[PDB]
Amino acid sequence: HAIFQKVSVNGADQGSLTGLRAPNNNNPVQNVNSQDMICGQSGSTSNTIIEVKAGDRIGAWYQHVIGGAQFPNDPDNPIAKSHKGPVMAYLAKVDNAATASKTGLKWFKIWEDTFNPSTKTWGVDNLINNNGWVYFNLPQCIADGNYLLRVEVLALHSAYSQGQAQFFQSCAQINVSGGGSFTPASTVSFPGAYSASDPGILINIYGATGQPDNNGQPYTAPGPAPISC
Numbered sequence: 001h002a003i004f005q006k007v008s009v010n011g012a013d014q015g016s017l018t019g020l021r022a023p024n025n026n027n028p029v030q031n032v033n034s035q036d037m038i039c040g041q042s043g044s045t046s047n048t049i050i051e052v053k054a055g056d057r058i059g060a061w062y063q064h065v066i067g068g069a070q071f072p073n074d075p076d077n078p079i080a081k082s083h084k085g086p087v088m089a090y091l092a093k094v095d096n097a098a099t100a101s102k103t104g105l106k107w108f109k110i111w112e113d114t115f116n117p118s119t120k121t122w123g124v125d126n127l128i129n130n131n132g133w134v135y136f137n138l139p140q141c142i143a144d145g146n147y148l149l150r151v152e153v154l155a156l157h158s159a160y161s162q163g164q165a166q167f168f169q170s171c172a173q174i175n176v177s178g179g180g181s182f183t184p185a186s187t188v189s190f191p192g193a194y195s196a197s198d199p200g201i202l203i204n205i206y207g208a209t210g211q212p213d214n215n216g217q218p219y220t221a222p223g224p225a226p227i228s229c
């Protein structure tokens, strides 16, 4: 249970919920065919469009609730340690990131932090150690203009049952300057890109000793592979 609620651009804090379409509650989305998969549950919307340069170091901040820890010494801030899973970031080109409908967009993945089998480290593990932040560079080649920036935590602690994987998503409204001429060869739909039966969604991550180490096996994140310039 956590909410993507803040963006940083090359270390510059943009402010809580500034430029975000984020849910009001930290409850997970579990139906991969729901419209809630696009930007999380409908909650707060911002009029701000975050100005970014292609290649910038983007930070995405998860916290247990809106504003940080739910209470002093909250053990589930930024997110419960049991919630092992990947973190993924997608882009969708839109004309107007402040007014565009989240429905029917053409998404492509730009980054993911999934699972390292030799270190037994999940993307969520890195999120926790970075105090809720996940860091990734916008591709140098993406074209100028407005995008929705979709960041997604997929918690797999009870994903061994159908439809029980937990998704925590929000969208950031951005405008890219100094970009290139990249257009994705292929795009995916949200909802639609994920299926409940995907090997990275319907999965038992627990090993011999009951640890969430995926039995040291490689993990296949759902959706397309990250694009390359």
Ligand SMILES: [Cu+2]
Binding pocket: 001, 002, 028, 080, 083, 155, 166
């Ligand atoms: Cu949770």
